[PDB]
Amino acid sequence: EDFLGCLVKEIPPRLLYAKSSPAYPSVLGQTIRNSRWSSPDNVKPLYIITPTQVSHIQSAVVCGRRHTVRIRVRSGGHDYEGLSYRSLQPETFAVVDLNKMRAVWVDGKARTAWVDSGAQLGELYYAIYKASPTLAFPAGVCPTVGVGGHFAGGGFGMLLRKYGIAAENVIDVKLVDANGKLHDKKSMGDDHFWAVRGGGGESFGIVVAWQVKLLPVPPTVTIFKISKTVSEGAVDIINKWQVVAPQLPADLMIRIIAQGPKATFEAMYLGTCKTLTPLMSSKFPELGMNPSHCNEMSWIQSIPFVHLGHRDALEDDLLNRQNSFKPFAEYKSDYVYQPFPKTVWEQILNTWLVKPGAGIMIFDPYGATISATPESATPFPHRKGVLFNIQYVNYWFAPGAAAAPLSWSKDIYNYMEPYVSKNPRQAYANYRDIDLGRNEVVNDVSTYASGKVWGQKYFKGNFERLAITKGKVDPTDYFRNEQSIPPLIK
């Protein structure tokens, strides 16, 4: 009652939603991306606040502290476990939903931009394009992902070999801390500014906006998508890829998608077909690339082309808030440091990807710029020595059909254990997976020991620094979820 009373005192009431508000179901659902988490059995927020100004965010946080109601912040809603808008067990929380805070102000000459956290990646990319056809920003492949959660968790895409992760191309932030105080890099200090850029969402406060550096790209880039079935030699070709791809020049990234006994090699090359063709013949002739495979286009056009295979619908693909795609979805991830034996590739392609409920596997090669950053330089630790990341993606489209895909996801993770990183088994924070472990709360504070179990998987040797920083900026564990950094205090 009095939390709401506090809010109503400080924030326009049209931006406040209670469970009985006519628009509450629509507002809650607008950026839910996973049909597992939209159904009525999920724990729902007591209130939703949709700020349009930073002062609204500050007021909400102050009210939450005064009245001990915790807040889960949502930007784009893509959290794989829905932790921006649901809790796992019954509890009281509000959602602060930033979708109305979505401005992207580009300074083309300075090669910087201020990007509100509620902007989607496609809007960031498009605004850069409206300023220049030869500037880019290295973030993810999915246009509807929110800036806020993506940057907080690191963020990587088809420019990761050239420029690293999104969070390491952030030069300032505007942030509201657990006390409602507005911060930037200077006021935050080294530890807090280190942590917020890749240490995971929620834990380190609400980032309102991010200042980014913009990076040059050639006026023409080249994409190819070359598939090989097992009959066409996929096993031998992927067995070569895993050694070659992380060693290729920074201008060339060749990822793989597999969803049966066939691998699709998807490349983005910062250059022309004319130079790509001989590069491929020299470094990876086994793929059989020739100029007919080239698709030359602008960098901005590569975003819909890579993700959707579209060539012709730039605005529709990048400026999309309809939320039409809502699979039931499960996700896992791994990091690989040692090449798989050929027999493991055989099993993956011929056996694991031909099972009931089998998902898709996406393999992103590292090396080059992402791997040149030291493991501790940012919270994202998956750097030197990484050959590739694996994402295991399971989509399905019927309620009551979760058993088979969920079992497959668990079973393949067990199969892969001997071949991927260990001690700890590394995972990417933005590919959130609650089965890696969850927090225990004691005396209303997430415990350090429970956080460490999953935290070392996402953050390796950076976990303790994250937790000490958490203890300094939020000792009472105000901004938390089931898998957020616990405070480590004296």
Ligand SMILES: *Cc1cc2c(nc3c(=O)[nH]c(=O)nc-3n2C[C@H](O)[C@H](O)[C@H](O)COP(=O)(O)OP(=O)(O)OC[C@H]2O[C@@H](n3cnc4c(N)ncnc43)[C@H](O)[C@@H]2O)c(*)c1C
């Ligand atoms: C759905 C989806 C996700 C993808 C896709 N492709 C990706 C890619 O090419 N590269 C990647 O690096 N990641 C990809 N992912 C995963 C996303 O990066 C993650 O799912 C992001 O965490 C999503 O961010 P967002 O859409 O903003 O999701 P939310 O659910 O709102 O938040 C996630 C997490 O972060 C906290 N949080 C949100 N907003 C803030 C702010 N402003 N400040 C701090 N913390 C914030 C939330 O509370 C939550 O814990 C492709 C597709 C299709």
Ligand SMILES: [Cl-]
């Ligand atoms: Cl996620």
Ligand code: NA
């Ligand atoms: Na290890």
Ligand code: NA
């Ligand atoms: Na999951």
